[PDB]
């Protein structure tokens, strides 16, 4: 009978394909690298993770998005997000099912999770610096679908954050450099040690090249995306 439109989510696959292509072009091995030619400021992301707390020993991973909304991915594989109005909540279970509630009007079974989210929110506000504070996100964030944290992991050197909109963010611990990868735009935003930022179209990095600093981080990114797909 009728089919409808089953979700065949290709975003991670597309990201791998894009990274494989850019890396195979050996972008830092050029007679003259012309990195600026690959800039595309219009591809600036709408959302990224601005703060995070790994309390997975007890509760889960709490995070803030750049629009000031907060979320928690709990240890039971459920998600709770509080919008930037500070009142409205979205609850996402293990199967991806979404429901809506508020801090004052909610199912009793979610009381603990709401209390914990508030603890995460307050902790991040009191203690943590907002990443990309100098970045104005792409216009229309209120009109876009607010993403949640699908997957995350930490390596020795980085945290890898996979958002439901297909974006993958990699924050490097030692030097505070960060990558925001979007497979829809086929773009990467690089935040350097000085907090200066640039957005590049990956296909243009293939054509024009880039510095060793970015090229090496894109090789690492490919490895991380492979891990997400594994």
């Amino acid at each position: 009978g009728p089919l409808g439109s089953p979700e065949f989510d290709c975003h991670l696959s597309d990201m791998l394909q894009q990274l494989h292509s850019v890396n195979a072009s050996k972008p830092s091995e050029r007679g003259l690298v012309r990195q600026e030619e690959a800039e595309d400021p219009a591809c600036i992301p709408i959302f990224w993770v601005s703060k995070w707390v790994d309390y997975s020993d007890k509760y889960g991973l709490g995070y803030q998005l750049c629009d000031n909304s907060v979320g928690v991915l709990f240890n039971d594989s459920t998600r709770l997000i509080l919008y930037n109005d500070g009142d409205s909540l979205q609850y996402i279970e293990r199967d991806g099912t979404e429901s809506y509630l508020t801090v004052s009007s909610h199912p009793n079974s979610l009381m603990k999770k709401i209390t914990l989210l508030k603890y995460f929110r307050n902790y991040m506000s009191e203690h943590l610096l907002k990443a990309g504070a100098n970045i104005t996100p792409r216009e229309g964030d209120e009109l876009a679908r607010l993403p949640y944290l699908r997957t995350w992991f930490r390596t020795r050197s980085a945290i890898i954050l996979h958002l439901s909109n297909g974006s993958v963010q990699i924050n490097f611990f030692q030097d505070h450099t960060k990558l925001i990868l979007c497979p829809l735009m086929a773009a990467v935003t690089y935040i350097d040690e000085k907090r200066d930022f640039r957005t590049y179209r990956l296909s243009l990095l293939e054509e024009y090249g880039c510095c060793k600093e970015l090229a090496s981080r894109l090789r690492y990114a490919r490895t991380m995306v492979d891990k997400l797909l594994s």
Binding site: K51, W52, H127, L128, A131
Partner: peptide
């Protein structure tokens, strides 16, 4: 672990 502090 946590992100960068103030």
């Amino acid at each position: 672990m946590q992100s960068t502090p103030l």
